[PDB]
């Protein structure tokens, strides 16, 4: 279903990384954030929801997902929350590790990893990328 994303939080090099996975496509968005707060989650969601159609998000029960500040952003943006694909998170960490030396800070490395994850092809020269799958899924939901 085209409007469903899983959102989830993870750590590397002592920093925090917010990761949102589009479940039908495997398309990812992620960013290093300064602390594991609901405020940072809220801002991150607004950005995501302004770029793609976000209808429902799945998360866990961490306080950085159940706060008012997050619930206010969801109400504003028209996003339904569900509480309760660890696969795309492992793929991302592998990617990050591999490009890590091509960038000075982790924050840049993470965006290089996201670029790669979304552009990469499985199944050869003819295979599809997460980035191509998501715009296809969304394009055929309008029509």
């Amino acid at each position, epitope marked *: 279903s085209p409007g469903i994303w899983q959102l989830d939080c993870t750590h*590397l090099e002592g920093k925090v990384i917010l990761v949102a996975v589009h479940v039908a496509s495997g398309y990812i968005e992620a960013e290093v954030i300064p602390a594991e707060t609901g405020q940072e989650t809220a801002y991150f969601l607004l950005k995501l929801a302004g770029r793609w159609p976000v209808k429902t998000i799945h998360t866990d029960n961490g306080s950085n997902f159940t706060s008012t500040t997050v619930k206010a952003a969801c109400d504003w943006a028209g996003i339904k929350q569900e509480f309760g694909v660890e696969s795309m998170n*492992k*793929e991302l*960490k*592998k*990617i*990050i*590790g*591999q490009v*890590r*030396d091509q960038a000075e800070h982790l924050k840049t490395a993470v965006q290089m990893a996201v670029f*790669i994850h979304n*552009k*990469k*092809r*499985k*199944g*050869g*020269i*003819g*295979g599809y990328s997460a980035g191509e799958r998501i715009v296809d899924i969304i394009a055929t939901d309008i029509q």
Partner: antibody
């Protein structure tokens, strides 16, 4: 130029122990998932364990759980397989291999390796016998 | 604990032949299948990854394909250096597992 050179294999008695090393060069082993895969004499290939030092995760085949410990020393660009409580059936050639995440084609495209192992060492023989 | 059933075990061929080796996964493993070649006393060398991508430097006569849970490695025109043993692998589920092998030997 990438390579892997394993060592530490030899003859050892049942119940004995050994430690294999895999020294890497041409690349930073911290950044990649490294596997041990073994081959009993005249048999096929059996996955043994892996480690991805960057993230700290590790993993083991059921037939080695409790007996084997994979690890890495980044200062030496080397991975290790500590093998305790050895039985006759652990006799095998042991290979270390690198798993890359992706391959970059050198003009703007990327391909996922999906767990494939791009470079392997020549292997070291471990014989377990009375 | 996923099984990769590789066939045939052994195969006789001649230089110039089309050769095709198969691997059946005991349940969907998606596209996460690789193929390796191994010669006597040597390490396995990677041929194909992610079902059908050709590893850098491997001759174009090697190719891979998928249908469902059935994977195929095909050598379009067998060369004298291709007589060897071949192995499939899946890395969709831990533990990752290998087929039992296919020896390609010379007809006469």
């Amino acid at each position: 130029e990438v390579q892997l050179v394993e060592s530490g294999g030899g003859l050892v008695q049942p119940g004995g122990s050994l430690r294999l090393s895999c020294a890497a060069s041409g690349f930073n082993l911290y950044s990649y998932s490294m596997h041990w895969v073994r081959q009993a004499p005249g048999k096929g290939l059996e996955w043994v364990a892996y480690i991805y030092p960057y993230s700290g995760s590790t993993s083991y085949a059921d037939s080695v759980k409790g007996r084997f410990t994979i690890s890495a020393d980044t200062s030496k660009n080397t991975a290790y397989l500590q093998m305790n409580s050895l039985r006759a059936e652990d006799t095998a050639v042991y290979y270390c291999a690198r798993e890359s995440s992706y391959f970059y084609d050198g003009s703007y495209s990327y391909y996922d390796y999906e767990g494939a192992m791009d470079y392997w060492g020549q292997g070291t023989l471990v014989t377990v016998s009375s | 604990d996923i099984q990769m059933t590789q066939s045939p075990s052994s195969l006789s061929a001649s230089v110039g032949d089309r050769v095709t080796i198969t691997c059946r996964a005991s349940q969907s493993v998606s596209s996460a299948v690789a193929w390796y070649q191994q010669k006597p006393g040597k390490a396995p060398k990677l041929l194909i990854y992610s079902a059908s991508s050709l590893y850098s430097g491997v001759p174009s006569r090697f190719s891979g394909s998928r249908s469902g849970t059935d994977f195929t490695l095909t050598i379009s025109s067998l060369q004298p250096e291709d007589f060897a043993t071949y192995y499939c692998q899946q890395s969709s589920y831990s533990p990752l597992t290998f087929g039992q092998g296919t020896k390609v030997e010379i007809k006469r």
